[PDB]
Design an enzyme around this catalytic site. Structure first.
Site, mmCIF file in Angstrom:
data_model
loop_
_atom_site.group_PDB
_atom_site.id
_atom_site.type_symbol
_atom_site.label_atom_id
_atom_site.label_comp_id
_atom_site.label_asym_id
_atom_site.label_seq_id
_atom_site.Cartn_x
_atom_site.Cartn_y
_atom_site.Cartn_z
ATOM 1 N N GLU A 157 -12.867 3.968 5.287
ATOM 2 C CA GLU A 157 -11.749 3.132 5.835
ATOM 3 C C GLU A 157 -12.252 2.540 7.384
ATOM 4 O O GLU A 157 -11.659 2.579 8.383
ATOM 5 C CB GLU A 157 -10.439 3.623 6.176
ATOM 6 C CG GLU A 157 -9.923 3.870 4.625
ATOM 7 C CD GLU A 157 -8.324 3.782 4.675
ATOM 8 O OE1 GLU A 157 -7.741 4.610 5.547
ATOM 9 O OE2 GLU A 157 -7.701 3.647 3.506
ATOM 10 N N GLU A 278 -9.489 3.550 -3.144
ATOM 11 C CA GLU A 278 -8.302 3.978 -3.024
ATOM 12 C C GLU A 278 -7.447 2.720 -3.254
ATOM 13 O O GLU A 278 -7.529 1.590 -2.721
ATOM 14 C CB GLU A 278 -7.944 4.555 -1.581
ATOM 15 C CG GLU A 278 -8.630 5.813 -1.322
ATOM 16 C CD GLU A 278 -8.232 6.273 0.166
ATOM 17 O OE1 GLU A 278 -7.309 5.687 0.680
ATOM 18 O OE2 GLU A 278 -8.947 7.297 0.678
#
Ligand SMILES: O=P([O-])(O)O
Ligand SMILES: O=P([O-])(O)O
Ligand SMILES: O=P([O-])(O)O
Ligand SMILES: O=P([O-])(O)O
Ligand SMILES: O=P([O-])(O)O
Ligand SMILES: O=P([O-])(O)O
Ligand SMILES: O=P([O-])(O)O
Length: 346
Positions: A157, A278
């Protein structure tokens, strides 16, 4: 493993791999062990997730977990007798070995530099890029002979100050991913390299409404110097119960979404191997819209020729989405499973 000219993952044999995946958290936290071992037996919990149809797992970890004398916490050793005395490293060793014996693919994930929050960049004020690369090599070196270990998700991320192709070394995620790539492949040349997006970028990006690790737009201006037959793009995307983006509020919703997904990652599906590292949400336990949102994402993924990825998550105790298991750590969210099997084509 490798990527063929059809943007498919093939194994050593040369057969196409499909990642019916899910995220399994814990090893990147203060406990330094996969979660739920207060409620369940670790081996039995793995047995269960394979039985639901999953054949792939994304394993977050943190540097501390990889150290020799880091001890685990929250483990109920009545239900997990064979983990008693083991260091967290030895438990990771044992878990990856179990996935391997069951024939489950494993994508390791460098999730956090400090067993807490997710860093904007690949380095912090207490975790250098050198340490980052060394930790990637450590993991690659250790598990390179474990056949069902797929490769490495270089850094989880990227966001905030992270940029891509701006000529600024301190913030350019693309160049840091190239250096991470080189490190891993020098040690494990048969591993895949998963690269995530960033958020807002000063060049080659329409900004706003981007989730962490969710923007791949600057790749159009600045190609990655990573071998075509190893590069796996793995952005993240979430729905209304992670953040209420403005477009969620639109009257058109969810018909407006495909253009947004296309912009952020989708447009790259036709020329790069791509899946979601994700994606997920409460699926109606949390909102009216998250049901709709997840349904639409699957419909869009199927249309882009994508039938794989890693759901978020296995564990219930993820704030803001829940998981496949309910809070009793035994009951399975059947509607979530029916959605995934739809995506998988099963
Ligand atoms: O496995 P290779 O031939 O793609 O390197
Ligand atoms: O064992 P490490 O975390 O020092 O590489
Ligand atoms: O029960 P095991 O995996 O320690 O043999
Ligand atoms: O890891 P954090 O909580 O210091 O951001
Ligand atoms: O323990 P490391 O992160 O310095 O390799
Ligand atoms: O200046 P860089 O980011 O291209 O190395
Ligand atoms: O970099 P692309 O535009 O060929 O995907």
């Amino acid at each position: 493993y490798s990527i063929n000219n059809s943007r498919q993952i093939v194994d050593d044999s040369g057969k196409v791999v499909q990642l019916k995946g899910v995220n399994v958290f814990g090893f990147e936290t203060g406990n330094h062990v996969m979660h739920g071992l207060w409620a369940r037996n670790w081996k039995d919990m793995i047995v269960q997730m394979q039985g639901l149809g999953f054949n792939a797992v994304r394993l977050p970890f943190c540097p501390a977990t990889l150290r020799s004398d880091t001890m685990p916490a929250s483990i109920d050793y009545s239900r997990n007798a064979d983990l008693q005395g083991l260091t967290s490293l030895q438990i990771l060793d044992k878990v990856i070995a179990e996935f391997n014996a069951r024939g489950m693919y494993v994508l390791l994930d460098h999730h956090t530099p400090d067993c807490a929050g997710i860093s904007e960049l690949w380095y912090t004020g207490s975790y250098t890029e050198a340490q980052w690369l060394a930790d990637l090599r450590f993991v690659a070196n250790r598990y390179k002979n474990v056949p069902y270990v797929l490769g490495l998700d270089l850094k989880n991320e990227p966001h905030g100050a992270a940029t891509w192709g701006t000529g600024n070394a301190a913030t350019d995620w693309n160049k840091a991913a190239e250096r991470g790539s080189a490190a891993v492949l020098a040690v494990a040349p048969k591993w895949l390299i998963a690269v995530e997006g960033i958020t807002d970028n000063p060049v080659c990006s329409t900004n706003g409404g981007i989730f962490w690790g969710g923007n791949l737009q600057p790749l159009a201006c600045t190609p990655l110097n990573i071998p075509a037959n190893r590069l796996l793009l793995a952005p993240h995307v979430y729905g209304p119960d992670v953040f209420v983006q403005s477009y969620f509020n639109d009257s058109n919703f969810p018909n407006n979404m495909p253009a947004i997904w296309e912009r952020h990652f989708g447009q790259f599906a036709g020329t790069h191997a791509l899946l979601l590292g994700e994606f997920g949400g409460k699926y109606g336990e949390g909102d009216a819209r998250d049901k709709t949102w997840q349904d639409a994402l699957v419909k869009y993924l199927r249309s882009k020729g994508i039938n794989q990825g890693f759901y978020w998550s296995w564990n219930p105790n993820s704030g803001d989405t829940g998981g496949i298991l309910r809070d009793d750590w035994t009951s399975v969210r059947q509607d979530k499973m029916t959605l995934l099997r739809t995506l998988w084509g099963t």
